[PDB]
Amino acid sequence: PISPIETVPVKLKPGMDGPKVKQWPLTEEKIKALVEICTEMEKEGKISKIGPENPYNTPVFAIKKKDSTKWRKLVDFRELNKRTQDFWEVQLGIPHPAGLKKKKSVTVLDVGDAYFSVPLDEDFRKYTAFTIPSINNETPGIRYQYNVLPQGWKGSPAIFQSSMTKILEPFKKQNPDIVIYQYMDDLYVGSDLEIGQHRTKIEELRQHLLRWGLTTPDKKHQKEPPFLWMGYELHPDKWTVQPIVLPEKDSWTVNDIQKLVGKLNWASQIYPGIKVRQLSKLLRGTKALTEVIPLTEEAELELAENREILKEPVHGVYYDPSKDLIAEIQKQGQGQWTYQIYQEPFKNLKTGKYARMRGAHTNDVKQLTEAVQKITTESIVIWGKTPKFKLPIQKETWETWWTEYWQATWIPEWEFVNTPPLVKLWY
Amino acid sequence: PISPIETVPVKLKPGMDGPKVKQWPLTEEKIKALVEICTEMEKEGKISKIGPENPYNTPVFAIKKKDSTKWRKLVDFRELNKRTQDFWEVQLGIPHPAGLKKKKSVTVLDVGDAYFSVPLDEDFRKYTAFTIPSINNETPGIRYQYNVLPQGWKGSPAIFQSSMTKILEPFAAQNPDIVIYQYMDDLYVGSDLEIGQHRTKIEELRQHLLRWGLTTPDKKHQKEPPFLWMGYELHPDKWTVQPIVLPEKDSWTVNDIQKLVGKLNWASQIYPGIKVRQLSKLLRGTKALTEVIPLTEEAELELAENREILKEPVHGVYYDPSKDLIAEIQKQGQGQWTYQIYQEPFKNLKTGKYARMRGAHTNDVKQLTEAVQKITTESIVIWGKTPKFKLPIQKETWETWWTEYWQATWIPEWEFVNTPPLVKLWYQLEKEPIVGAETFYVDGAANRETKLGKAGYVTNKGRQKVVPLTNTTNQKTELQAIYLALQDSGLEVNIVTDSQYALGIIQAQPDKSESELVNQIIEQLIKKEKVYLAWVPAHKGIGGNEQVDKLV
Ligand SMILES: Cc1cc(C)c(Nc2nc(Nc3ccc(C#N)cc3)nc(OCCCN3CCOCC3)n2)c(C)c1
């Protein structure tokens, strides 16, 4: 493509040097795929080899987007983002529609191929350097830097925003009810249409974007495949902050009423208007744990009142756009995971529960990875930004295998926890 | 001895300027010694004279070694180094021999002038200027620059490897069979070509390099293969560690123990069963180099154990990509582990161990899991794949644990090895309380000042006991109360405690610990048939709590 307007001048935060991040070691298989991909990109002007005078580095990974046959390069621009986008969230920020979360169906479209046309600022190219590593330190890595807007960079859709809103406008006029939102490499398209028409309307957009130059390889063929559900089609109407259920038993043992209640007494840190005392008067006899204790009048009156009080959500819990989002996840067994998204402790902006299957075909790391992506997509749709996870996993075993079931293009901030709670079935 | 290599463009740190430091006192007659070197360097085009205009002088030194037939002189560039840009960092680690492939023949070439053979960027040479001051009254001294990569300079290492790499490309592309490794001023060439063609090919490579001003030798090595490379010993069919010696003393300084634990770690890559438990537990604190540390009794057995291993020599085999990559782990009881990596029954590619100094309450299955983690990383570095594991654990015991553990855990394909000591689960807490079993409402309390406390219990059978405590803390009494209930109860027992801490230790199912109390409790839990531990809010609880808590 012809070089358009000269390269958009890109500056960074005052006194912030480029990213200098070490390159994770990779399998031979991945280095091979990374090599093919890069000599193919270099062959197309997208990237160029660099010298020892470029001291910066940004990690690279080989994932499998279609995971069918061919690989896909995933640059991790988390560090460079923090060093540039913080002044490209300000200088060129894309506005986040608060209505996207209310649409009946939201489809995600990868439009990452768009950027590969536009040149990047010559003076800025240096900071996009990445290294294809060598096994056993045989050869110093293969070093490239970008010549066009890199995928994974937040600064790319910011620079491409005008061109994108222009391509989209003649579709937004025909369909004024459809909310379209560009987060990085993806468009989030949400309509209140019925499922059948919503997909037909997405295909109209795919073809519209195509006859203006943009490809969107995520579709494959809808005609004749084997049994396989779509990659991404969300329904944010379901997404709320779920209430915590108390055990429904026909009779109660001391132990039952002692494991009481499912986060009560700590729920008093979430729902402050709770009295447990007239339930604590139901034992006081140094009883055998397995002994059955009958209900009294005042005991039921502090249960029924402490039950409908949990189905009435917290008050004063609002989103703070200056505070980062925090997502904690708890492994629950039986192929199930519970999570919470918050900013200040016990003030939950969102809670949900991921569920894969009964088991015997899916391991922990796969589940957690899918859960982190699943949560992150909720965070994007809802607040326009991603959370910082506190993962129930050893650091190195995540840093080894996270890229194995990672189908997403963005990457959230990690963090690893070491102390388990008693708050397992408290959720 | 220089070449028309494309120089690499170099900048200074954005706001900085060239170094304008000097040296006033001189070294007497050692000035003309620096003259003889410079003119001979100038004639070779390495340096160039210049008049003192817009100069950035850099201090100059001269130094002879013992019986030096030829003097050697060099410039301290630390100030300039602080002012020049950062580069792409040179080779982090080194290629580990266990992951090299065997060849019919290998050669090693030492590049001559190395740094002075590669030109320096023109617009940057102004900053490498230095002076040769003569006599007094500030008479016009001799001032030069550098036309090539200066010896000590910050950019010399990375620029050289960049040049060398570019220079090898028109030969590597004329020789796909030959593989070449670069490393510092060294070059390590190998091939499966028959020794005739290989000797010719090495000679072609030399003549290539020589026409690019890089001098290389025809016969230089003071010692032939095996190669005394990097603490290693590389033979044509095997690799091993360059011989190390564990020195014997009567008194041990921290530095000497610092050296010893390093020489042992460096040996642990091939010599199986090396231990650094009590030898490292001495360097825990307080750290002071010249301080003399008394050698403990257990630390002396360990050293004796390691000496017995280091006695006879052991070697490792190289990598065959066509054959499986197996790794097997053995437990060594005291929190330490060992592993071997191999493709063949009687030879190892390498060995190694796992530290495990995390926390004060740990578990055998978790430790094993961390070992599989450490090895998978090491495998991915050296060979670029993950090994098939051979592990001393039943699949029932593994399955039970990861299903029960709060963290996510993953483990690649692994097979059980019946060879003891096995990794078991020495006890499992009941998930539900036990009908017919006595209930022990325990609680422990203490004073953080008097350091006195009480550990007691009260049961549903009406039984009660309270034991006084000294030298204790609220966390010690909270566990002592549990331990007491176990002592006094039958083969099945329900225990109720008000301590998140206590329940925390027990529910972690540790089989070993660094607390004698916790270990004793473990012994009881193994001996009991069924144990259910239950939690209850401390302050506002049932009422059987403050019955022994209000005693303190
Ligand atoms: C001190 C030193 C000396 C040399 C020559 C090397 N290089 C080197 N060593 C070996 N092993 C060896 C060492 C010493 C002796 C003796 N005597 C016999 C075999 N195999 C290769 O080359 C292996 C090439 C494998 N491939 C081929 C292409 O894909 C990438 C890697 N390169 C090294 C790494 C260190």
From Swiss-Prot, chain B:
Effect of residue 224 to A: No effect on RNA-dependent DNA polymerase activity. No effect on RNA 5'-end and 3'-end cleavages
Reverse transcriptase domain mapped to chain residues: 44-234
Region RT 'primer grip', annotated ranges: 227-235
Intracellular or extracellular location(s): Virion
Effect of residue 440 to L: No effect on cleavage between p51 RT and p15
Site description Essential for RT p66/p51 heterodimerization, residues in chain: 401, 414
Site entry: Cleavage: 440-441
Effect of residue 52 to G: 74% loss of polymerase activity. 86% loss of RNase H activity
Reaction catalysed by this enzyme: Endohydrolysis of RNA in RNA/DNA hybrids. Three different cleavage modes: 1. sequence-specific internal cleavage of RNA. Human immunodeficiency virus type 1 and Moloney murine leukemia virus enzymes prefer to cleave the RNA strand one nucleotide away from the RNA-DNA junction. 2. RNA 5'-end directed cleavage 13-19 nucleotides from the RNA end. 3. DNA 3'-end directed cleavage 15-20 nucleotides away from the primer terminus; DNA(n) + a 2'-deoxyribonucleoside 5'-triphosphate = DNA(n+1) + diphosphate
Effect of residue 187 to A: 76% loss of DNA-directed DNA polymerase activity. 60% loss of RNA-directed DNA polymerase activity
Binding site for Mg(2+) 1: 110, 185-186
Phenotype for residue 156 to A: 74% loss of polymerase activity. 56% loss of RNase H activity
Motif Tryptophan repeat motif boundaries: 398-414
Result, substituting residue 398 to L: No effect on RT p66/p51 heterodimerization
Top-rank taxon, per record: Viruses
Transmembrane region(s): none
Impact after mutating residue 438 to N: Virions contain primarily p51 RT
Reported effect, residue 539 to D/N: Severely reduces exonuclease activity of RNase H. Probably also reduces substrate binding affinity. Modifies cleavage preferences of RNase H. No effect on the endonuclease activity
Known outcome of mutating residue 186 to E: Drastically reduced incorporation of phosphorothioate nucleotide. Loss of pyrophosphorolysis (reverse of the polymerase reaction). No effect on RNase H activity
Consequence the record notes for mutating residue 227 to A: No effect on RNA-dependent DNA polymerase activity. Complete loss of RNA 5'-end cleavage. No effect on RNA 3'-end cleavage
Record's miscellaneous remark: Error-prone enzyme that lacks a proof-reading function. High mutations rate is a direct consequence of this characteristic. RT also displays frequent template switching leading to high recombination rate. Recombination mostly occurs between homologous regions of the two copackaged RNA genomes. If these two RNA molecules derive from different viral strains, reverse transcription will give rise to highly recombinated proviral DNAs.
UniProt-recorded name of the protein: Reverse transcriptase/ribonuclease H
Species name: Human immunodeficiency virus type 1 group M subtype B (isolate BH10)
Taxon lineage: Viruses, Riboviria, Pararnavirae, Artverviricota, Revtraviricetes
Gene name of the record: gag-pol
Whole-protein residues included: 600 to 1151 of 1447
